[PDB]
Design a protein around this ligand. Structure first.
Ligand SMILES: *[C@@H]1O[C@H](CO)[C@@H](O[C@@H]2O[C@H](CO)[C@@H](O)[C@H](O)[C@H]2NC(C)=O)[C@H](O)[C@H]1NC(C)=O
Ligand SMILES: *[C@@H]1O[C@H](CO)[C@@H](O)[C@H](O)[C@H]1NC(C)=O
Ligand SMILES: *[C@@H]1O[C@H](CO)[C@@H](O)[C@H](O)[C@H]1NC(C)=O
Ligand SMILES: *[C@@H]1O[C@H](CO)[C@@H](O)[C@H](O)[C@H]1NC(C)=O
Ligand SMILES: *[C@@H]1O[C@H](CO)[C@@H](O)[C@H](O)[C@H]1NC(C)=O
Ligand SMILES: *[C@@H]1O[C@H](CO)[C@@H](O)[C@H](O)[C@H]1NC(C)=O
Ligand SMILES: *[C@@H]1O[C@H](CO)[C@@H](O)[C@H](O)[C@H]1NC(C)=O
Ligand SMILES: *[C@@H]1O[C@H](CO)[C@@H](O)[C@H](O)[C@H]1NC(C)=O
Ligand SMILES: *[C@@H]1O[C@H](CO)[C@@H](O)[C@H](O)[C@H]1NC(C)=O
Ligand SMILES: *[C@@H]1O[C@H](CO)[C@@H](O)[C@H](O)[C@H]1NC(C)=O
Lengths: 123, 124, 109, 123, 123, 124, 109, 124, 109
């Protein structure tokens, strides 16, 4: 509606409603440069989709997980984060903890997937 | 030889709480599921709760589902049961038992292999 | 939730049958019925598991079977040391894990 | 059973039993031409998989949504679509309306994701 | 914690807990050789992901199915397979049956999707 | 003309089992869902079970859910109902009918349009 | 779970009605009420389906309607041979599929 | 200042239907969840229905799940409740209230923030 | 379905406590217990939320706490304007969103 990055300056609670607009624009000798550009775009897309798969978020744009939020990563209240801040500011604020969060998300799915298997193994 | 020894408490007043703790030895603790089974002084056996080998999953009888918490510590090789809101109907000998579940890659059980000595829990 | 007689007896050295009657959702649907021997003052011991399979350490005198929704344990060669309360444990699915209803006092004459 | 496009002339119902036959054959200067062919095939595959993901249909070959069928797109009953008709004829009929349906599918999934997020946020 | 393929010599049970450790390592004129190698890495990844999709296992690493083990592919019990065998030995042991198993998995999903559709068609 | 013939059993003892068959002709068998409906000798009609056209999905009334199995063999145009643990409350005429469901790509039914003659099943 | 009158009657050539009452979860919410005509000694056949529609092979004397949670079958032009037990069949949902009422005996005077 | 004004009617016969509506101002309508709460003339408060801010999710007390529909117009600021098949047991003052649910990205509520004065609905 | 006493009272300037007891699935599970003050002839007003919190616009006299399955409202010194019917409202999960108690008629002597 607003455009490819039209919500980039909007608050997180507004920009989160345009996730399909950005998602649909991630896929689409001089031949070498053009092919490298296309292969790189594909590789980045697949890295993100694989990472979502590892976390159990495949096929979703808004994925709820079982990892608790640590107040040391960000001590802002939920209203302050979603009503008075943009995603660029948040991305900067949480940059130093992103890999920590990603590790926990992987661990969470690893435990959950085993737990699902055990629930399914009950007769 | 496999041993399970309960080190829990005795008499608690109605509405209070009591924690049981079972010390396990003679086998790899993390390889087996654990459960608590109770027997009223004049009755037969009653299953109370079951915990998986990793501790991630717990199951309870409906009569205790909102009152008892079952947990494990696989580094100390112990099983704990925290019983809240104890009722007069909960007076029983509580036995620590090994078995009751298999973690998908193990052969099936659905039976209890080892039983502890049993702690006597009473409610005034 | 299982029906089991309160007591059985028989001559020493002979066979006695102890049985539990359940329903289709427990004894019938799942072949996971086990039998326990509880001597007074002691914790129950496992005698039979998976309906017919005995654990190591138990003699060949204890053997079970099932038909329909009824499971049974036959104890041959009754000894003076076999006086104990016997119980069934049926698996009744993920909503109702175990049913321990019962308790048969075995008297060896 | 019938081959890669063996069901192409069969009715829409019969051809719905062969979706894996067609799906498994979508992935598999001379170097530049071969690379362009492979990259283009990959991009088409990924665009279709991304589009299914946006609709909430990731990982499925048959996916049912909450978008009602509008009689203005096609007023033929089920006995005229799933029998007595092939998928090629249907595609010829559902041409001018394909982008409308895709837009509705995207909006429906966006609402589904927000509703799931709110339901999962209830304690 | 053992790194990529670190569990290769461990038992199947222990190794099943390290799937995410190596799953991340499947995506990550002289320009053509490197570019073709990158495209092949993508094609192999996508063929495996498509195959998981066909089986209804998209987005999961440990996927349980409805296909019974027939005891002719391998008659070993779970104790020997999971506690006394590695994945390389298992892969060799049932290599000759993998195409049979994959075919059954495809057929199982084809029936399941129709069943889900029929269940979803009830009011 | 569509015909359904319930070539099944008759009298059973309490606690026993009885199987009913239903042969059909005059239409494509593997295109309609089928069901069994019973009528006690002095009562009205009661639905018992429903099976899809492909046979993969079955539904039962709670009173028979753990006792009856409904199945089809589309190569012989045969529907069957295997009834275990029959009781006196199950005495009825059991009618075979070509309907009660459709496989999503067909028009809705929920009709039970073609009926057979009915097998009489009694419990002593 | 549906309520029907034990019997109805009328003279040849007159119109008669048979009603069925259910609840909001069956007659109300789902427009899948069907009516059957069972002659004594014979299997029932379908007379009305989808509340108002009739199958090919029967006359237009039989018609239906629904209002609120009440379904109704009207038989106009009653014939001497229209003597039968009539039943409703309502679709109840995914947990419960079909609900039948008691039979209504239609006697032609 | 938040103002919630019910404009629904007050008299219906048994078996009939009545639609109530609530107009609101003083706050952004689309930012809050809303509910209807009822009080019988001689009883305390009873929760009847809850709708989220967007309007796509509705919840009802078991006693009205098959009879009442709650909806809201976020273009204009109107909360509506359509009550079908009203019974004598439903006579009550029906209050319009703001709160009861937060949409995942908002702080938790699970309480009612604002109340209207209520419409009195008499059955019979 | 919460239980709280009727007719709690005291003199102006004295402290009173109004409390309600629920079960392990509601007050003892979720710490989302609110209190409302309903003057006769008026709609209920919110006084306490989230067990201990109060909205802006009311005095500091009204406060509360939770222990076990019992919630408790304290009013500090009573004033004539406090003569109202007080109610508990507890969150009770996804199937039963809210459970209310009966009213406590607070009398200021
Ligand atoms: C960019 O910021 C402006 C404000 O500077 C936003 O416009 C309005 O901001 C006020 C702030 O109180 C809101 O109440 C209005 O609703 C906003 N207008 C609209 C039309 O929504 C503006 O929306 C912001 N732009 C983006 C893209 O988010
Ligand atoms: C948050 O991070 C700190 C870092 O010191 C850690 O100690 C704490 O346990 C973490 N808490 C949670 C809930 O993850
Ligand atoms: C969030 O934090 C800010 C910090 O200034 C504060 O003003 C605001 O009231 C807080 N909001 C909530 C809902 O706690
Ligand atoms: C991240 O770490 C660097 C270390 O120099 C620090 O300067 C920066 O402020 C940190 N960022 C955040 C968002 O905490
Ligand atoms: C082609 O049509 C005939 C009927 O004319 C049918 O029997 C046959 O199955 C159809 N072929 C395919 C591939 O669907
Ligand atoms: C169907 O499409 C037509 C196109 O003109 C549109 O006017 C109509 O509103 C649509 N109906 C629905 C229910 O979406
Ligand atoms: C579908 O439409 C065609 C139009 O000719 C009609 O003949 C056919 O009977 C309709 N089918 C159904 C099931 O309504
Ligand atoms: C689509 O629009 C074109 C405009 O020329 C028209 O000719 C064509 O018939 C339309 N297609 C359908 C399927 O209605
Ligand atoms: C290799 O074998 C030894 C045998 O004792 C075992 O302890 C060790 O864990 C194995 N290594 C791996 C990587 O699994
Ligand atoms: C598995 O089979 C082997 C023989 O191949 C046997 O020695 C072993 O005891 C069996 N284990 C189980 C758990 O049945």
């Amino acid at each position: 509606s607003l455009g490819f990055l039209g919500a980039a300056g909007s608050t997180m609670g507004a920009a989160s409603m345009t996730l399909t607009v950005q998602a649909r624009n991630l896929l689409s000798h001089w031949g070498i440069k053009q092919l490298q550009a296309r292969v790189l775009a594909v590789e980045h897309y697949l890295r993100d989709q694989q990472l979502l798969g590892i976390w159990g978020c495949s096929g979703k744009l808004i994925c709820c997980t079982n990892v608790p939020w640590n107040s040391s990563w960000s001590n802002r209240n939920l209203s302050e984060i979603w009503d008075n801040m943009t995603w660029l500011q948040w991305d900067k604020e949480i940059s130093n903890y992103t890999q920590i969060i990603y590790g926990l998300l992987e661990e969470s799915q690893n435990q959950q997937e085993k737990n699902e298997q055990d629930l399914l193994a009950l007769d | 030889e496999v041993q399970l020894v309960e080190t829990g408490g005795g008499l608690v007043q109605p509405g209070g709480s009591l924690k049981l703790s079972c010390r396990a030895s003679g086998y790899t603790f993390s390889s087996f599921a654990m459960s608590w089974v109770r027997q009223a002084p004049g009755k037969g056996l009653e299953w109370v709760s079951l915990i998986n080998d990793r501790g991630g999953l717990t199951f309870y009888v409906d009569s205790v589902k909102g009152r008892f918490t079952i947990s494990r510590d696989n580094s100390k090789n112990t099983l704990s049961l925290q019983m809240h809101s104890l009722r007069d109907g909960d007076t029983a000998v509580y036995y620590c038992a090994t078995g009751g579940m298999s973690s998908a890659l193990q052969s099936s059980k659905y039976y209890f292999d080892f039983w502890g000595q049993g702690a006597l829990v009473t409610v005034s | 939730a299982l029906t089991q007689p309160p007591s059985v007896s028989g001559s020493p050295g002979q066979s006695v049958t102890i049985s539990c009657t359940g329903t289709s959702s427990d004894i019938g649907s799942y072949n996971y019925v086990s039998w326990y021997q509880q001597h007074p003052g002691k914790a129950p011991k496992l005698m039979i598991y998976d309906v017919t399979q005995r654990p190591s350490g138990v003699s060949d005198r204890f053997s079970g079977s099932k038909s329909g929704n009824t499971a049974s344990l036959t104890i041959s060669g009754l000894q003076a040391d076999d006086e104990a309360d016997y119980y069934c444990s049926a698996y009744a699915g993920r909503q109702t894990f175990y049913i321990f209803g019962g308790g048969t006092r075995l008297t060896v004459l």
